Design a protein around this ligand. Structure first.
Ligand SMILES: [Zn+2]
Ligand SMILES: [Zn+2]
Lengths: 118, 118
């Protein structure tokens, strides 16, 4: 079969890409919280590093008791042990990406993994 | 020390996050091409799976001779062997994310990797 899979996601749709795109190196979740709302729980990871990318709006994320302000354009790496909990701003919703990957699994990349054709 | 790292990226800035955020499970590149422009070369990967997310605009991506139309909200998985080359539309720029991760490296995730804190 094809060396790729594609799908379209609505502007304000909440979905996970792993099963729909048959990912093998990560899980990607697209989500967003309305103003004044936030993830109702705190969590960490056993072996997965997590990368957050704020696509729109603004808000906060509490990591190990410390709350960090967030706005569109902000990107964060969170180690497995980090206890996290994101939430939207009081006067604004927030849209973000959560890339889950096995910590320390990356080897070569770009220069050391890409192959130019002819 | 801290269990996280943060940085801000300008709306139209082109950067790679691996070194700046000290990622260990992936490389994330944020890029965008002006109307009528495109990556000047074709490439594949030795062992990294690649996930593309179109954040804005529209364009095309040619994978193994087949060109696929792209627009904001589109997400794709590309296997290592896939020969790819993205470009913007003739009448519009395109902004996208390229998540590079080692293919088949993901094990548990979400339900099988997240840990809720009481
Ligand atoms: Zn690549
Ligand atoms: Zn998580």
């Amino acid at each position: 079969m094809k060396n790729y899979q594609k799908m379209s996601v609505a502007q304000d749709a909440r979905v996970e890409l792993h099963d729909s795109l048959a990912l093998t190196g990560a899980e990607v979740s697209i989500n967003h919280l309305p103003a004044g709302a936030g993830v109702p729980f705190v969590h960490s990871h056993k072996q997965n590093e997590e990368i957050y990318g704020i696509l729109s709006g603004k808000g906060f994320i509490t990591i190990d008791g410390e709350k960090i302000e967030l706005q569109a354009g902000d990107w964060l790496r969170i180690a497995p042990d980090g206890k996290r909990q994101i939430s939207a701003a009081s006067d604004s919703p927030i849209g973000f990406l959560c890339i889950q990957v096995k910590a320390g699994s990356l080897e070569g990349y770009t220069m050391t993994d890409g192959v130019v054709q002819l």
